[PDB]
Amino acid sequence: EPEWTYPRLSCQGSTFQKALLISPHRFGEARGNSAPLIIREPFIACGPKECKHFALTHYAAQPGGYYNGTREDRNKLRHLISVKLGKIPTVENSIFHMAAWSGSACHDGREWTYIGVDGPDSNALIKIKYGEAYTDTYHSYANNILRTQESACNCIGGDCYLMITDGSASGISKCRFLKIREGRIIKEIFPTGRVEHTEECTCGFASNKTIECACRDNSYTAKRPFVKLNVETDTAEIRLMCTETYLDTPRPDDGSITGPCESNGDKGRGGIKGGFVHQRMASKIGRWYSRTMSKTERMGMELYVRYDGDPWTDSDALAHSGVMVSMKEPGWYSFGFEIKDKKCDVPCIGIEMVHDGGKKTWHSAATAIYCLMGSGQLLWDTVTGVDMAL
Amino acid sequence: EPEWTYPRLSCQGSTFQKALLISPHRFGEARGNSAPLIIREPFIACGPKECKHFALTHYAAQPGGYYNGTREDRNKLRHLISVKLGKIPTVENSIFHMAAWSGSACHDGREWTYIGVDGPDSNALIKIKYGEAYTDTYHSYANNILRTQESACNCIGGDCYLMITDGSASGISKCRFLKIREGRIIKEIFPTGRVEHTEECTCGFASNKTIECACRDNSYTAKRPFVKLNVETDTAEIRLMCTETYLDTPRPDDGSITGPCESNGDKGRGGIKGGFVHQRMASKIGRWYSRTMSKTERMGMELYVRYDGDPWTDSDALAHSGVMVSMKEPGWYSFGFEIKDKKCDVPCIGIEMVHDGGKKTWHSAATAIYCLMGSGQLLWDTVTGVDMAL
Amino acid sequence: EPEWTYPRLSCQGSTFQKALLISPHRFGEARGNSAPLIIREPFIACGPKECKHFALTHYAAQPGGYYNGTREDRNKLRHLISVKLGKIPTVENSIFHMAAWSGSACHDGREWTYIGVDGPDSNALIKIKYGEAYTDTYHSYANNILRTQESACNCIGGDCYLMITDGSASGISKCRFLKIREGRIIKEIFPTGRVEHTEECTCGFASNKTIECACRDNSYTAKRPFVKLNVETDTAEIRLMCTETYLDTPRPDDGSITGPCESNGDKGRGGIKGGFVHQRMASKIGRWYSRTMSKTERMGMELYVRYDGDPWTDSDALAHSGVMVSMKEPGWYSFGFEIKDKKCDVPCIGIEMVHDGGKKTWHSAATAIYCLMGSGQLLWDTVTGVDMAL
Amino acid sequence: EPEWTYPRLSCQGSTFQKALLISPHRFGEARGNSAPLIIREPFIACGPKECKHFALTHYAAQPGGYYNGTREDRNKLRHLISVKLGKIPTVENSIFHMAAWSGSACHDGREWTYIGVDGPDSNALIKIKYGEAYTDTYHSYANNILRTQESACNCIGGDCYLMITDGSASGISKCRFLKIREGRIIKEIFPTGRVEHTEECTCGFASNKTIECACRDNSYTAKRPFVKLNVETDTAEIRLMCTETYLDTPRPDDGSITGPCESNGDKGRGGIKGGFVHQRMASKIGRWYSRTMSKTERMGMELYVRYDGDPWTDSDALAHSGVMVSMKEPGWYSFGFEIKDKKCDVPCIGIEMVHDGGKKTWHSAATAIYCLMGSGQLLWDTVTGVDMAL
Ligand SMILES: CCCN(CCc1ccccc1)C(=O)[C@@H]1OC(C(=O)O)=C[C@H](N)[C@H]1NC(C)=O
Ligand SMILES: CCCN(CCc1ccccc1)C(=O)[C@@H]1OC(C(=O)O)=C[C@H](N)[C@H]1NC(C)=O
Ligand SMILES: CCCN(CCc1ccccc1)C(=O)[C@@H]1OC(C(=O)O)=C[C@H](N)[C@H]1NC(C)=O
Ligand SMILES: CCCN(CCc1ccccc1)C(=O)[C@@H]1OC(C(=O)O)=C[C@H](N)[C@H]1NC(C)=O
Ligand SMILES: *[C@@H]1O[C@H](CO)[C@@H](O)[C@H](O)[C@H]1NC(C)=O
Ligand SMILES: *[C@@H]1O[C@H](CO)[C@@H](O)[C@H](O)[C@H]1NC(C)=O
Ligand SMILES: *[C@@H]1O[C@H](CO)[C@@H](O)[C@H](O)[C@H]1NC(C)=O
Ligand SMILES: *[C@@H]1O[C@H](CO)[C@@H](O)[C@H](O)[C@H]1NC(C)=O
Ligand SMILES: [Ca+2]
Ligand SMILES: [Ca+2]
Ligand SMILES: [Ca+2]
Ligand SMILES: [Ca+2]
Ligand SMILES: [Ca+2]
Ligand SMILES: [Ca+2]
């Protein structure tokens, strides 16, 4: 049948470039004739021949009459939807996979695994679908909003890994990893180290032996929790990123958190899911990350890279690698993903660009894509082009 | 060629969970740009690779100008349509299979069989289509609205079985079963037993030897007629389910119908098609059923199960297994179906949630899907989210 | 590669039944959200796995602003379009094949041949496309509106046959047949017999050796010109249908044309393209035909059949086989076609049901389908359901 | 795998004929329900099985609220999009390939290569995508709007050749050719000859050894720069076409540029991209070209041909071969392309017909297609049918 998929060396390249903007609300004007779906938390995952652009819809279109409530996180109507990357996610072009107010998905070489969380806050549920068939669930172990990545899970040899957490977004959230094979949970991994508060991990393969993730601590630090997961022993350890280039929002100024790598620092409450993707070379490993340009609001988005070293011990500043979204434009969640070329994998970061006018209007987002492409430096930024009054 | 489909053991699991809501009219606002089809009597049937969501449209969309007449059951415009499950059934997303005001469909491992009934009330006609070709018909035997399941037929080794009936909805309607192979009726099956009124059977496989069905009696009882059909002898027998948990609507209080299992009891006139699906295990069979929360109106929907026993003689209560639709929301027809996972079958029940504002406005429905998924207990209910005024 | 296609014996059956209605303007209301294409001259042709529903669009949608001019026959904007049968022919669901104000198409087993005529009236052009590639043309031989079938051409062993004509619709139109193989004209057949005025032939296989067509004489008779074409010698002869059941509109009363079979009779000026399809049995040949119910206007449509005999010598009345469209509904062009079942061919007649409100509004049509299905008699008629004011 | 595509001998034929009009804005009325994309610079490229219709959208639809800015050439929103040729390029029918305000694309027998340029004017960037993956980039060499063909690139044995240029549109712009294999630049080709200004080359294969291109000089002449590129040595040479039939717009009267073949002549500033395609025969080569009917404005389009000779030294007039667009209708860019029939290639020219109502309204285009088809002479012209006020 199809071979199972594995991480491969990345395609040659040394800079990212602007690739593609999916801005559905460019066609949502009241005088227009389209039906872009109102969504948030977009992410992309690719199989061998195609990528799918996922998001959590509020099950409402622009223009329409169900804008009230579209700025809330969880309810009984939100669903995980997708379109093939490059198609506009409208009512008709999308597929509704399952009810979900938190999601993930990934292809293993043979088939797609879709993950969607719903249920009441005190007792929510991870539901897993493999292709068409609902195949498994996982229960709330801390009875406070069981939730997951909002980005691609990661499969190697048929084993797909997924970060989940449950418990307080303001206190302790001890996260866990699930190992899922053909839609069924075959192992639960309890991490070690700094496990007190890890949210919305963005994960990817550092090699065939290691998954790494850069996550969000919503209460104590603007340094990102960083996961190293050994795929062969099914063990994970988490410690803060030591770089003075703190990747969360809010954050203090770079280099301002004194003391050892584990020091929490100021402006730690609050957070944002951040992009991270690997460039695997025969010789070395590139780790690419994104963060907003404002230190306090979800505005702008800049790319950074560092080759090798240990993210847990290295306080060195990451190398600035281009403005993907200026300060004038929204820069909300970002995520890594990889496109499969014939012989190598292309690392990319996607950027959620939320159209926020508060609760008295519709709330949704565009998705911008940057990928490793040629040499030199990143050349152009992305704007959504949407006027929320139309 | 591909080979013929057979029932397999069900996938492991012990509770149903909310899976998917297809709520087309969330996009039918006058100020929106979508064209959801006005439908009723939805059902789902799946082949090895995909499930189709079928319904009987009134050949009208919302917003639109043909709302008058969409509350009627039968006319020259109704058609059997489908979309791939997960797509919104809109004017352009749907395929129109055949003219029909009663329908069924099922896949035999190789091709789809579509069933549509139309024709004058006194001389209506079952029409069968195999793939793209119209292959056979069956004539009215009692000249009083020949009609069929409104849920999936059931194929084993190329033979597809279908319930049909003809007769007064407030008098005698003696059903029959058709055995259909590659779109052609190869055998008529005349049931034995309590045969005076059987409607809208929801049928599935209890094993490779037995199809069972939970049906509606619209005239005499609130207990469901229960068919056991032996596929090897092509014989069927019907008796009333003896459980005190009467699955019809209207119904009297549970356990209030005194006397032997076959006693009709009180609040017998009227009815609703009911969900039923099997959970086949190596040595145990789970029978899952749904019924409205109101005893008299089509409001809410609750799940019930019983393992083993004989439905014809067990008076014990069915075990309540979750509120799928609250008393506040519409609960009209329900039906069972199975999704084909790689090595096993996933039992599910779908729920038609009709938007009824009377004869004065459009009339149509959302479809809610619940499936056997994991263990523990059912966690959340389904709302359509539709404001019929928009 | 794919085998070339041949006519096969028809599937068992002895009556037609209502199969499917494609009524796109059921969704064309000004307050709705759809874009049905404004069309006329629909026809259907099938390959081994799918049928396509063709028509000549005016390149305009309802609702829209280009209604003026949609009641004219030829212009620089009309195009041959199609959708898979069962899909609604809207702006987006359709494929535009080529510029054309007269058309035909057919599948040969391996690929589709599309035929579209355009150009100025005095010097028009048959253009032939095989799949994606424009492959050949044929010139106007009489410089008066070169034109073709408005129904499926017919392929056997890779050879596809097509009737064309050129010359006066009120005087002499000597028609011709083209033999097209892989999109290229490989023979021109000059018919013999009554060749003075043959229009819009509806053709099909009587056997592997003979194509037959029932055509329209627009100036001299209400009897249909009937073509017998020997596929092996590539010769054709044409003579009038002798049946007293005159199939054209206008027409006099049945049996009223006195004298031999060739006698022209009264009310011969004017005409309509008529449905005709074969039921090939091992033993005998069924010839099915349709005609309007009004003897003078394009209202209603009735089915007729006769087995065996020679259409050129037999004055016997055809057997009335059901009202497909009542007198209250439009009955304009009709055409035969065949759907391919696994082992046999299903004969069908399609009916163009024009929405005509004159030139001050839009002009388009619905398509109704009837096919051979089971035994007994035809049970129900078709209405478009469209109110042209909406 | 499939194998690499090579030029083949053209299909038999001696005249072009009107083939297809894709006029999206026939459905863009304010009272309509469609969403045609606002585009410019359309072109078509075909693989073995299908042709794609590409254009540069302004990421806006008609009707809509983003018309301001749609007359500009370059901005952060323009994207390269396509549909299968024959589909209307609407918001939902199109795929968005990459951010781009100059584009090209072509199929090599195995996969599609997409080319998109964006970035700041002084430092723009060629981006290449092979299938779904971004594979390589090329940087600005003259820091003045690096840009490319706006028509199909050309592949032979897996090597795809592309013209690019960079420099002042009213001064020096020395083009270059990129040799691209599986999405990666494997060679730069620096032309020899009259190299001071070459833009928007329309290129194709004269044989297995030679690509030829008819280009635009926007600064010095109304004669088209003509590239002969030797694919075996990967060398190119450019000289002005010597024909008195000057193919650019503006242009002086035919034959009025006196002196030797390389003389620039009068009315040289300004220009338009021009159609050119080859008709390869066993011993003769036809070179087909198009130019506007007006000498000074983008109004009308006429076809011309010349067999054999050397474009660089023949001053003889090109033979006029039909009016494709009358003086009354828009004739803006034209381009050549070839459709792959079963054993031979069909040469065609497409014509962008821009709807220009100035900066005050939307700005976009229809695409007209003419192809070598049969013999005799070209018979009809193309109108867009669009009233820009609706
Ligand atoms: C911190 C990341 C996840 N949390 C915290 C959930 C939580 C709240 C209170 C107590 C416990 C848990 C968020 O809120 C996420 O934030 C955001 C956000 O933009 O900050 C978007 C997500 N839609 C939301 N996720 C869920 C599942 O609601
Ligand atoms: C009882 C279930 C089937 N019947 C009885 C039909 C009948 C009426 C009167 C005399 C004889 C027969 C219904 O009315 C069904 O009810 C309902 C319903 O919601 O109860 C929906 C179906 N659209 C309708 N089916 C048909 C075929 O009309
Ligand atoms: C008689 C059938 C074909 N003709 C005659 C064409 C003609 C007119 C005058 C002189 C010569 C030829 C028709 O008009 C057809 O009639 C009709 C019709 O509904 O009667 C529809 C067709 N759109 C039209 N065909 C063309 C190609 O215009
Ligand atoms: C001359 C053809 C390319 N140029 C020159 C670009 C340029 C301007 C000024 C200085 C340097 C370069 C054009 O302006 C093209 O013109 C036209 C046009 O209609 O003439 C359409 C193209 N959208 C545009 N291309 C770009 C890439 O902007
Ligand atoms: C990972 O392992 C697979 C399977 O053995 C191999 O094909 C692939 O190229 C490896 N990836 C690396 C070395 O990054
Ligand atoms: C039914 O029989 C088939 C073989 O005909 C077998 O493959 C399948 O697993 C059986 N299923 C059950 C439920 O017994
Ligand atoms: C026609 O000929 C083909 C090929 O020989 C055959 O397969 C087919 O069944 C024949 N059709 C008839 C007998 O009608
Ligand atoms: C070009 O060469 C290929 C083989 O490489 C051949 O198949 C093809 O017909 C040739 N075409 C021309 C136009 O010479
Ligand atoms: Ca934080
Ligand atoms: Ca829509
Ligand atoms: Ca009852
Ligand atoms: Ca006549
Ligand atoms: Ca549309
Ligand atoms: Ca010039």
CSV table of N, CA and C in Angstrom, one decimal, chain B residues 258-333:
chain,number,residue,atom,x,y,z
B,258,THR,N,-49.8,-2.5,30.2
B,258,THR,CA,-49.9,-3.7,31.0
B,258,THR,C,-50.3,-4.9,30.0
B,259,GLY,N,-50.2,-6.1,30.6
B,259,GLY,CA,-50.6,-7.3,29.9
B,259,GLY,C,-49.4,-7.9,29.1
B,260,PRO,N,-49.5,-8.8,28.2
B,260,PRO,CA,-48.4,-9.5,27.6
B,260,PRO,C,-47.5,-8.6,26.7
B,261,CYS,N,-46.4,-9.1,26.2
B,261,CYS,CA,-45.5,-8.3,25.3
B,261,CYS,C,-46.2,-7.7,24.1
B,262,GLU,N,-47.1,-8.5,23.5
B,262,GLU,CA,-47.8,-8.0,22.3
B,262,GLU,C,-48.9,-7.0,22.5
B,263,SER,N,-49.3,-6.6,23.8
B,263,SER,CA,-50.4,-5.7,24.0
B,263,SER,C,-50.1,-4.3,23.4
B,264,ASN,N,-51.0,-3.8,22.6
B,264,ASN,CA,-50.8,-2.5,22.0
B,264,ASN,C,-50.7,-1.3,23.0
B,265,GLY,N,-51.5,-1.2,24.0
B,265,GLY,CA,-51.6,-0.1,24.9
B,265,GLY,C,-52.1,1.2,24.2
B,266,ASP,N,-52.0,2.2,25.0
B,266,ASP,CA,-52.5,3.6,24.9
B,266,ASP,C,-51.6,4.5,24.1
B,267,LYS,N,-52.1,5.7,23.6
B,267,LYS,CA,-51.3,6.7,22.8
B,267,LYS,C,-50.5,6.1,21.7
B,268,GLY,N,-51.2,5.2,21.0
B,268,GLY,CA,-50.7,4.5,19.9
B,268,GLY,C,-50.8,5.1,18.6
B,269,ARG,N,-51.6,6.1,18.3
B,269,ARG,CA,-51.8,6.7,17.0
B,269,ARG,C,-50.7,7.7,16.8
B,270,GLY,N,-50.2,7.8,15.6
B,270,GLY,CA,-49.1,8.7,15.4
B,270,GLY,C,-47.8,8.0,15.6
B,271,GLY,N,-46.7,8.6,15.3
B,271,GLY,CA,-45.4,7.9,15.4
B,271,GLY,C,-44.3,8.7,14.9
B,272,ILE,N,-43.1,8.2,14.9
B,272,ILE,CA,-41.9,8.8,14.4
B,272,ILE,C,-40.9,7.7,14.1
B,273,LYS,N,-40.1,7.9,13.0
B,273,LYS,CA,-39.1,6.9,12.7
B,273,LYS,C,-38.0,7.0,13.7
B,274,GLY,N,-37.5,5.9,14.2
B,274,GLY,CA,-36.5,5.8,15.3
B,274,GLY,C,-35.2,5.2,14.9
B,275,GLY,N,-34.1,5.8,15.6
B,275,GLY,CA,-32.8,5.3,15.4
B,275,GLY,C,-32.6,4.0,16.1
B,276,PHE,N,-31.8,3.2,15.4
B,276,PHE,CA,-31.4,1.9,15.9
B,276,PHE,C,-30.1,1.4,15.2
B,277,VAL,N,-29.1,0.9,16.0
B,277,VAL,CA,-27.9,0.4,15.3
B,277,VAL,C,-27.3,-0.6,16.2
B,278,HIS,N,-26.6,-1.6,15.6
B,278,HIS,CA,-26.0,-2.7,16.3
B,278,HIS,C,-24.5,-2.5,16.6
B,279,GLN,N,-24.1,-3.0,17.8
B,279,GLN,CA,-22.7,-3.1,18.2
B,279,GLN,C,-22.4,-4.6,18.4
B,280,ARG,N,-21.8,-5.1,17.3
B,280,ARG,CA,-21.5,-6.6,17.3
B,280,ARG,C,-20.2,-6.9,17.9
B,281,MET,N,-20.2,-7.7,19.0
B,281,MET,CA,-19.0,-8.1,19.7
B,281,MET,C,-18.8,-9.6,19.5
B,282,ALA,N,-17.7,-10.3,19.8
B,282,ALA,CA,-17.6,-11.7,19.6
B,282,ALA,C,-18.6,-12.5,20.3
B,283,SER,N,-19.1,-12.1,21.5
B,283,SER,CA,-20.0,-13.0,22.2
B,283,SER,C,-21.2,-12.2,22.8
B,284,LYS,N,-21.4,-10.9,22.4
B,284,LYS,CA,-22.4,-10.1,23.0
B,284,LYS,C,-22.9,-9.2,21.8
B,285,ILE,N,-24.1,-8.7,21.8
B,285,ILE,CA,-24.6,-7.8,20.8
B,285,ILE,C,-25.2,-6.6,21.6
B,286,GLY,N,-24.8,-5.4,21.3
B,286,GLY,CA,-25.4,-4.2,21.8
B,286,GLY,C,-26.4,-3.7,20.9
B,287,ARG,N,-27.6,-3.3,21.3
B,287,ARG,CA,-28.7,-2.7,20.5
B,287,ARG,C,-28.9,-1.3,21.1
B,288,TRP,N,-28.6,-0.3,20.2
B,288,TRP,CA,-28.6,1.1,20.6
B,288,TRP,C,-29.8,1.7,19.9
B,289,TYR,N,-30.5,2.6,20.6
B,289,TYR,CA,-31.8,3.1,20.1
B,289,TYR,C,-31.9,4.6,20.6
B,290,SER,N,-32.7,5.4,19.9
B,290,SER,CA,-33.0,6.8,20.3
B,290,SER,C,-34.4,7.1,20.4
B,291,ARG,N,-34.8,8.0,21.2
B,291,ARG,CA,-36.2,8.4,21.2
B,291,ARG,C,-36.3,9.9,21.7
B,292,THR,N,-37.3,10.6,21.3
B,292,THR,CA,-37.5,12.0,21.7
B,292,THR,C,-37.6,12.2,23.2
B,293,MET,N,-37.2,13.3,23.8
B,293,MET,CA,-37.3,13.5,25.2
B,293,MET,C,-38.7,13.7,25.6
B,294,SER,N,-39.5,14.5,24.8
B,294,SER,CA,-40.9,14.7,25.1
B,294,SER,C,-41.6,13.4,24.8
B,295,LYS,N,-42.7,13.0,25.5
B,295,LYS,CA,-43.5,11.8,25.2
B,295,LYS,C,-44.4,12.1,24.1
B,296,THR,N,-44.8,13.3,23.9
B,296,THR,CA,-45.8,13.7,22.9
B,296,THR,C,-45.4,14.5,21.7
B,297,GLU,N,-44.3,15.2,21.8
B,297,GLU,CA,-43.8,16.1,20.7
B,297,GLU,C,-42.5,15.8,20.2
B,298,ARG,N,-42.1,16.3,19.1
B,298,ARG,CA,-40.7,16.0,18.5
B,298,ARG,C,-39.7,17.0,19.0
B,299,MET,N,-39.4,16.9,20.3
B,299,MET,CA,-38.5,17.8,21.0
B,299,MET,C,-37.6,16.9,21.8
B,300,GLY,N,-36.3,17.1,21.7
B,300,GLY,CA,-35.2,16.4,22.3
B,300,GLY,C,-34.9,15.0,21.6
B,301,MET,N,-33.8,14.4,22.1
B,301,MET,CA,-33.5,13.0,21.7
B,301,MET,C,-32.4,12.5,22.7
B,302,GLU,N,-32.7,11.3,23.2
B,302,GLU,CA,-31.9,10.6,24.2
B,302,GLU,C,-31.6,9.2,23.6
B,303,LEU,N,-30.4,8.7,24.0
B,303,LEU,CA,-29.8,7.5,23.6
B,303,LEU,C,-30.1,6.4,24.6
B,304,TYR,N,-30.3,5.2,24.2
B,304,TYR,CA,-30.5,4.0,25.1
B,304,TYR,C,-29.8,2.8,24.6
B,305,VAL,N,-29.4,1.8,25.5
B,305,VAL,CA,-28.8,0.6,25.0
B,305,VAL,C,-29.2,-0.6,25.9
B,306,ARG,N,-29.2,-1.8,25.2
B,306,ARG,CA,-29.3,-3.0,25.9
B,306,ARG,C,-28.5,-4.1,25.2
B,307,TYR,N,-27.8,-4.9,26.0
B,307,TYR,CA,-26.9,-5.9,25.5
B,307,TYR,C,-27.7,-7.2,25.7
B,308,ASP,N,-27.7,-8.0,24.6
B,308,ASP,CA,-28.2,-9.3,24.4
B,308,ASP,C,-29.7,-9.3,24.7
B,309,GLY,N,-30.3,-10.5,25.1
B,309,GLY,CA,-31.6,-10.7,25.3
B,309,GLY,C,-32.5,-10.8,24.1
B,310,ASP,N,-33.8,-10.9,24.2
B,310,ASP,CA,-34.6,-11.0,23.0
B,310,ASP,C,-35.5,-9.8,23.1
B,311,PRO,N,-35.4,-8.9,22.2
B,311,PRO,CA,-36.3,-7.7,22.1
B,311,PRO,C,-37.8,-8.0,22.2
B,312,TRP,N,-38.2,-9.1,21.7
B,312,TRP,CA,-39.6,-9.6,21.6
B,312,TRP,C,-40.1,-10.0,22.9
B,313,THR,N,-39.3,-10.4,23.9
B,313,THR,CA,-39.8,-10.9,25.2
B,313,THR,C,-39.3,-10.1,26.4
B,314,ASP,N,-38.2,-9.4,26.3
B,314,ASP,CA,-37.7,-8.7,27.4
B,314,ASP,C,-38.4,-7.4,27.8
B,315,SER,N,-39.1,-7.4,28.9
B,315,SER,CA,-39.8,-6.2,29.3
B,315,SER,C,-38.9,-5.2,30.0
B,316,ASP,N,-37.7,-5.6,30.4
B,316,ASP,CA,-36.8,-4.7,31.2
B,316,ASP,C,-36.5,-3.4,30.5
B,317,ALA,N,-36.3,-2.3,31.2
B,317,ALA,CA,-35.9,-1.0,30.7
B,317,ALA,C,-34.6,-1.1,30.0
B,318,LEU,N,-34.6,-0.3,28.9
B,318,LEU,CA,-33.4,0.0,28.2
B,318,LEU,C,-32.5,0.9,29.1
B,319,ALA,N,-31.2,0.9,29.0
B,319,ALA,CA,-30.4,1.8,29.9
B,319,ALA,C,-30.2,3.1,29.2
B,320,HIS,N,-30.5,4.2,29.9
B,320,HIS,CA,-30.3,5.5,29.3
B,320,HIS,C,-28.8,5.8,29.2
B,321,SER,N,-28.4,6.3,28.0
B,321,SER,CA,-27.0,6.6,27.7
B,321,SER,C,-26.7,8.0,27.2
B,322,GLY,N,-27.5,9.0,27.5
B,322,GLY,CA,-27.1,10.3,27.2
B,322,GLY,C,-28.2,11.1,26.5
B,323,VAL,N,-28.2,12.4,26.8
B,323,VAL,CA,-29.0,13.4,26.1
B,323,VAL,C,-28.3,13.8,24.8
B,324,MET,N,-28.8,13.5,23.7
B,324,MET,CA,-28.1,14.0,22.4
B,324,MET,C,-28.7,15.3,22.0
B,325,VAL,N,-30.0,15.6,22.3
B,325,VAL,CA,-30.7,16.8,21.9
B,325,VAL,C,-31.5,17.2,23.1
B,326,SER,N,-31.4,18.4,23.7
B,326,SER,CA,-32.2,18.8,24.8
B,326,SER,C,-33.6,19.0,24.5
B,327,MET,N,-34.5,19.0,25.5
B,327,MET,CA,-35.9,19.3,25.3
B,327,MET,C,-36.2,20.6,24.6
B,328,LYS,N,-35.3,21.5,24.6
B,328,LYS,CA,-35.4,22.9,24.0
B,328,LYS,C,-35.2,22.8,22.4
B,329,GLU,N,-34.6,21.7,21.9
B,329,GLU,CA,-34.3,21.6,20.5
B,329,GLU,C,-35.1,20.6,19.8
B,330,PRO,N,-35.4,20.7,18.5
B,330,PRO,CA,-36.1,19.7,17.7
B,330,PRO,C,-35.4,18.3,17.6
B,331,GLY,N,-36.2,17.3,17.8
B,331,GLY,CA,-35.8,15.9,17.6
B,331,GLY,C,-36.8,15.3,16.8
B,332,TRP,N,-36.6,15.1,15.5
B,332,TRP,CA,-37.6,14.5,14.6
B,332,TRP,C,-37.1,13.1,14.2
B,333,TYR,N,-36.9,12.7,13.0
B,333,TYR,CA,-36.5,11.3,12.7
B,333,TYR,C,-35.1,11.0,13.2
